[PDB]
Amino acid sequence: FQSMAAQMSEAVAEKMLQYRRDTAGWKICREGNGVSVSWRPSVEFPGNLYRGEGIVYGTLEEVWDCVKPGGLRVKWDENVTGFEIIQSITDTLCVSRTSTPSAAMKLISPRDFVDLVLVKRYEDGTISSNATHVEHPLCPPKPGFVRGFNHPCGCFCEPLPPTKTNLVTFFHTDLSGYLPQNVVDSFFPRSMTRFYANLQKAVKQFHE
């Protein structure tokens, strides 16, 4: 069990690592203050993979405390209402349920996601989160939520040589249910720029 729970999650981080390095495919959506988001076709499902990049003005373990899988995310992230750690497998590997609220003028009704999420730490100091969908018998479709499926996604928290942190995040989400494309195509870009906007505010609160 261990050897494969660990295994398919290791595959996830491997893909995430490749998403971080790749410079190809990526077509820019928008930019502006602090952030930059681009996208490309996912190979995991019909839809897209989204890439956020942005310097967060906080210590590396403050920014991580915010996005770490419960901790903090329920608070500051407008797109999260419920975070539950279901089956805590390893020190560093666990199965989580995430509840999103309504979005895009109630066109996107609440979804929930059941992820295998692995925290893995790199040699440079980078701490990362690596999440993929998994079916779990103790967390089936809930009444009034659509079951969404995240494909390999999460956060890279990268220390900078000074007192700041680089945050690169990938949203790889299948909203699923029954949604027109253009709805979905508008939401995600905006969802990422708002994510960073929020994350920043949360950080600032420790420096105040």
Residue numbers in the entry: 2 to 70, 73 to 164, 167 to 213
Reproduce passages from the article:
Following recombinant protein production in E. coli, well-diffracting crystals were obtained for the START domains of STARD1, STARD5, STARD13 and STARD14. Their crystal structures were solved and refined to between 2.0 and 3.4 Å resolution. They are down- (STARD13) or up-regulated (STARD5) in cancers, mutations in them result in metabolic disorders (STARD1) or they are linked to obesity (STARD14;).
Steroidogenic acute regulatory (StAR) protein related lipid transfer (START) domains are small globular modules that form a cavity where lipids and lipid hormones bind. The ∼210 residue globular START module is a curved β-sheet gripped by two α-helices. The concave face of the β-sheet and the C-terminal α-helix enclose a hydrophobic cavity that can accommodate lipid molecules. Here we present crystal structures of four human START domains, those of STARD1, STARD5, STARD13 and STARD14/ACOT11.
